[PDB]
Design a protein around this ligand. Structure first.
Ligand SMILES: C[S@@+](CC[C@H](N)C(=O)[O-])C[C@H]1O[C@@H](n2cnc3c(N)ncnc32)[C@H](O)[C@@H]1O
Length: 198
């Protein structure tokens, strides 16, 4: 399957504690700066909704979603708006979003299913749309002490999967250094791609 059960089970049993941590906004600010005001944005794996809240306040039309009903519930309370429950592989929209934001969530997709998920995102994006996704880098898939699955890919592996998923007009990648929820130091790869213009 395109999702890991124990990963989702972790978020559904630790939603209160996890909802207390706010993600860094550096890459979000850069992302929004590359979009027109009021852009239509789909957020995948929105978690507690901190970033969806920021995007909405910034004037964007955000369709926030998360695979965990528990976290989606927390996000809906924070946003005062509907945060729907949706697993990545359930996406089936076509040319509906100017951009897609997926912060530290597609890293939970089983390696063999990532390309297919990226293809769904390609289809959901409008021509010329921007898609950002961050991943925890590594040299092989694994699972942390909290039972969360990570695809732990290299930039080269990610680029190969993105190329198989579809034709991208451009692919930009930058890295950052930060501590994960498990308090372990980790490197994150931020992939920003553009869907070809009409
Ligand atoms: C590390 S959290 C990041 C939440 C957020 N974007 C942030 O940076 O705070 C990983 C997110 O991916 C979501 N999740 C895990 N598996 C997923 C799946 N297969 N479909 C969609 N959501 C999923 C989890 O519920 C969780 O909210």
């Amino acid at each position: 399957q395109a999702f890991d059960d124990d990963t989702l089970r972790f978020y559904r049993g630790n939603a209160t504690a996890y909802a207390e941590r706010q993600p860094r906004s550096a890459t979000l600010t850069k992302f929004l700066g590359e979009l027109p005001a009021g852009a239509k944005i789909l957020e995948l794996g929105c978690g507690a909704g901190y970033q969806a809240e920021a995007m909405l306040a910034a004037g964007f039309d955000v369709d926030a979603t998360d695979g965990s009903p528990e976290l989606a519930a927390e996000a809906s309370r924070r946003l005062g708006r509907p945060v729907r429950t949706m697993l990545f592989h359930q996406l089936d929209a076509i040319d509906a979003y100017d951009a897609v934001w997926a912060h530290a969530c597609l890293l939970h997709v089983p390696r063999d299913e990532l390309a297919d998920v990226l293809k769904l995102i390609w289809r959901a994006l409008k021509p010329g749309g921007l898609f950002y996704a961050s991943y925890k880098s590594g040299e092989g898939e694994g699972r942390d002490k909290l039972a969360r699955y990570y695809n732990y890919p290299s930039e080269e592996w990610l680029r190969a999967r993105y190329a198989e998923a579809g034709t991208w007009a451009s692919v930009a990648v930058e890295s950052s250094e930060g501590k994960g929820f498990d308090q372990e130091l980790a490197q994150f790869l931020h992939v920003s791609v553009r869907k070809p213009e009409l």
